[PDB]
């Protein structure tokens, strides 16, 4: 058996798995899928009573694939493909578009970044700086050490908890040891 054999094995065993019939399924957190994972989803669309697909995008179309340069290329392309499969499979389809902000209701600037990220004819933010800050350090050492102080300021002063902070890096291999 191959690490990558389970998914193909799953896709063909789904039909005769009777407890997944009448099952409600939710998919979320995926930007895209592999053909193999795809094989599973469409096999789920057949034998499951309900399946909901959650995709991060902006009013995608199911007739045309996203152009090269648009932000929601991946998620849009997956929406178009998942929708065309549900169409050929003759499934009862329903749509739900989320318009308003939920995460950034109390944070205008972060709300600005999310909405104005794409459009090159981009409008500048006309308000005060508080939530968003860029910062320069002498080196990764000082960078983490500076961020470490910030985290303490946040938990000790602003009343946050450690579980509320998250630090990301495109190349964690560069900070992993020093962190």
């Amino acid at each position: 058996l191959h690490s990558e054999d389970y998914l193909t094995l799953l896709a063909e065993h789904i039909p005769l798995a009777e407890d997944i019939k009448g099952a409600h399924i939710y998919v979320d957190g995926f930007y895209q899928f592999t053909p193999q994972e795809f094989r599973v989803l469409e096999q789920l669309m057949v034998h499951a009573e309900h399946i909901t697909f959650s995709l991060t995008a902006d009013k995608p179309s199911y007739e045309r694939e996203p152009h090269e340069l648009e932000l929601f290329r991946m998620t849009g392309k997956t929406y178009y493909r998942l929708h065309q499969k549900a169409k050929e499979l003759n499934l009862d389809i329903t749509y739900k578009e989320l318009s308003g902000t939920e995460r950034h209701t109390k944070t205008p600037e972060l709300a600005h970044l999310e909405a104005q990220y794409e459009a090159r004819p981009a409008i500048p933010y006309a308000e005060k700086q508080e939530a968003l800050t860029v910062m320069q350090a002498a080196n990764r050492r000082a960078e983490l050490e500076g961020i470490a102080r910030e985290i303490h300021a946040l938990v000790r002063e602003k009343g946050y908890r450690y579980k509320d902070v998250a630090i990301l890096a495109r190349q964690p291999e560069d900070y992993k040891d020093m962190v």
Binding site: V155, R156, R161, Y162
Partner: protein, 36 residues
């Protein structure tokens, strides 16, 4: 000095929830995110 009071607090400060920061979130009773 001006900061005489702040400094002393911050050096005596502890983390209110610190007792839990070492406890595993998921714990199995018989996935790499749990423990036993």
């Amino acid at each position: 000095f001006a900061f005489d009071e702040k400094a002393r607090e911050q050096l005596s400060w502890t983390y209110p929830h610190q007792e839990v920061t070492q406890i595993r979130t998921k714990q199995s009773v018989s996935d790499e995110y749990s423990g036993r």
